Amino acid sequence: KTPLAILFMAAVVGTLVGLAAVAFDKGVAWLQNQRMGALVHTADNYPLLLTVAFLASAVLAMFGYFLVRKYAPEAGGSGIPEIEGALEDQRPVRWWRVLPVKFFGGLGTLGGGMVLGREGPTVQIGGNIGRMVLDIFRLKGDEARHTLLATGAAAGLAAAFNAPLAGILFIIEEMRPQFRYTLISIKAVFIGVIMSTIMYRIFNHEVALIDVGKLSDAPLNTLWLYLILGIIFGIFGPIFNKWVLGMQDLLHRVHGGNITKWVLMGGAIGGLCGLLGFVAPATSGGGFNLIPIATAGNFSMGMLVFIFVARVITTLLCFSSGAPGGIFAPMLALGTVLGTAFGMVAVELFPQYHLEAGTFAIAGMGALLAASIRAPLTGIILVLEMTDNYQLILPMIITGLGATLLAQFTGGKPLYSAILCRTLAKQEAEQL
């Protein structure tokens, strides 16, 4: 009955996921530029600059926590576990509530300077837009419910990163298990991902979303050092996931689910990350402003160690508090400062290999998206599409598959699966 109307509506999904995505990116960039642009006006007084860097980030984050805790308490956090749990018919898709809250409260949170990603809002906005097109064009059956939820979600990562290949390979490796799939479902997801990057590339004509320049090569007597980098990253992956879920119920003890104490904790958390945008800008922000600085070596090793310790204690504070933001971009810059700190000691230990710390940074950039969030194939092609260094593929397979092999040996679920089974275990804690 529906051979081609589901493929027309998938292009309608992919058009809106790519128009509501680049309006989100232009809204967090307009808010970031006029929050840093509000500090150059009061540059004469130093304590007045710190006040309006705290308060302009606090009331932007308090605007984001209030919209989540009052109107849609599922837009908090990433939103990828809420779409991953909606494709299994376990979580509801309330697009009339999450779409004005993940957009406008996700702006205020990300444009306020919190250490959170563009991809968490965009994947959940895309999952709700695909339900919105499904509801305003009333389609029957679960055959169209889940193929319009798969697109939008896959079209969201395709517009949050300009990654059409990594957007489809995300939902293959994360949300859809080993079964048999209709070719119309595969066709409709492709039209939505294609329409998502087209609406990105209409309004964003730049290549190299992470622009580092074309770096050195990795010779084959060097590729064993990227296997050591997978051992370091594959151990930290499950350790970081214990810290994410360990602070989700540690910051939950500050409040008790009280909305007036959640937004006052999120305004102190959001105001601290706007305070750390003028004092030390390398320890806050979404992370994408740090990846090209850390790749082509500008830091020391004492500063690069300090950046890593200060960024893990702000990635945890931003994500686990219940703010509408992603976790890829805080962890892409977290694997870049760890790959550079590994790359800076590999130059000194092995001067006969003619090494470069930037090749270990681009290799280790998607090695935390392989160990912590166990999607190694998605994390490799994402870094290759963002950072156009395609000659660094054989170090990326060595460090991306050696990370996800030891992430299973040490014992670790994916992060979006571990968050989802902690929200499914609590929605069944009221329904006895």
List the binding residues for chloride: 78, 327-328, 416
Instruction: Dump the DSSP string for 394-431.
Output: HHHHHHHHHHHHHHHHH----HHHHHHHHHHHHHTTT-
Q: Under rule CB under 8 A, how many of the chain's residues touch a second copy?
A: 39
Query: In the complex with Cl ion, which residue's Cβ is closer, 120 or 238?
Result: 120
- Residue 173 tokens read as 């490796």
- Distances from the Cα of 171 to the Cα of 65, 104, 167, 337, angstroms: 28, 25, 7, 27
User: Mask 6-45, x = binds a second copy (CB under 8 A)?
Assistant: -----x----------------------------------
**Cβ closer to a second copy: 7 or 259?**
7
Q: Is residue 260 part of the contact set for a second copy (CB under 8 A)?
A: no
Which one of Cl ion, a second copy, none is in contact with 194 (Cβ closer than 5 to 8 A by kind)?
a second copy
Contact 223, 398 (CB under 8 A): yes
Smallest gap from Cβ 358 to Cl ion, in A, equals 25
Q: Alpha-carbon distance 43 to 109, whole Å?
A: 24
User: With contact defined as beta carbons under 8 Å apart, do 197 and 162 qualify?
Assistant: yes
Nearest to 191 by CA among 4, 410, 400, 20: 4
178 binds a second copy, rule: CB under 8 A: yes
Q: What are phi and psi of 342, to 5 degrees?
A: -75, -40
Piece of 128-136, 198-206, 226-234, 281-289 that binds a second copy (CB under 8 A):
198-206
Give the nearest distance from C-beta 115 to a second copy in angstroms. 30
Q: Taking CB under 8 A as the rule, which mask of x and - marks residues 325-364 in contact with a second copy?
A: ----------------------------------------
Phi-psi region of 128 (alpha: psi -120 to 50; beta: other; left: phi over 0): alpha
Residue of 50, 59, 165, 268 that binds a second copy (CB under 8 A): 165
Least distance from a second copy to the Cβ atom of residue 400, Å: 12
Q: Which runs of E-coded beta strand occur in 239-357? A: none
If one asks whether residue 141 binds a second copy (CB under 8 A), the answer comes out as no
Q: Which stretch binds a second copy (CB under 8 A): 197-205, 222-230, 338-346, 363-371?
A: 197-205
Pick from 379, 409, 403, 392: which is nearest to 223 by CA?
392
Per CB under 5 A, residues contacting Cl ion are 77-78, 80, 119-120, 326-328, 419
